[model samples]
Target chain A: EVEALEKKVAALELKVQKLEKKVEALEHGWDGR
Target chain B: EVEALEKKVAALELKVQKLEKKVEALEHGWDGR
Candidate 1:
């Protein structure tokens, strides 16, 4: 389970990065997103 | 006042119209930068 995004934009970037990996997995055909 | 309540989310924007004043001053032969 992933944690929620933090208040600061820098911290929020971490959460977004994690989700972006999921999207990348889909586009790469790894069956994720 | 308002910024103190939400520092993280607040986006700062600054614009300076030096051209109107400085160029006018130059053409008019005034002073300052």
Candidate 2:
């Protein structure tokens, strides 16, 4: 169970990081005005 | 220990959801072009 949770946490961490990068890119494009 | 992991998972879930929303908003703004 612990291992499963650890895996989930790791996955979420990666997902969060990716989303953050995506948001940053979008924000940059929006601000390019 | 299980409870701690559960809490972490919950927090990450919320964080992920919030980031997703932020990304969505940014995408919308970018697409407004």
**All candidates' TM-scores?**
0.34, 0.67
Off by over 4 Å in 1: A1-7, A31-33, B1-33
A-chain TM-score per prediction?
0.49, 0.79
- List fnat per candidate, in order: 0.06, 0.94
- Tell me the TM-score of chain B in each candidate: 0.36, 0.81
Assess each model's interface with DockQ, reporting 2 decimals per model: 0.03, 0.62
lDDT of each: 0.41, 0.78
Local accuracy of candidate 1 as per-residue lDDT tens digits, A1-33? 012212444544554565456446545757532
lDDT of 2 by residue, B1-33 (tens): 799879979987997988787677766665562
Pick out the ten consecutive residues of candidate 2 chain A with the lowest summed lDDT.
A24-33
The worst-scoring run of ten residues by lDDT in candidate 1 chain A lies at: A1-10
Best by lDDT: 2
* Candidate no. 1 TM-score: 0.34
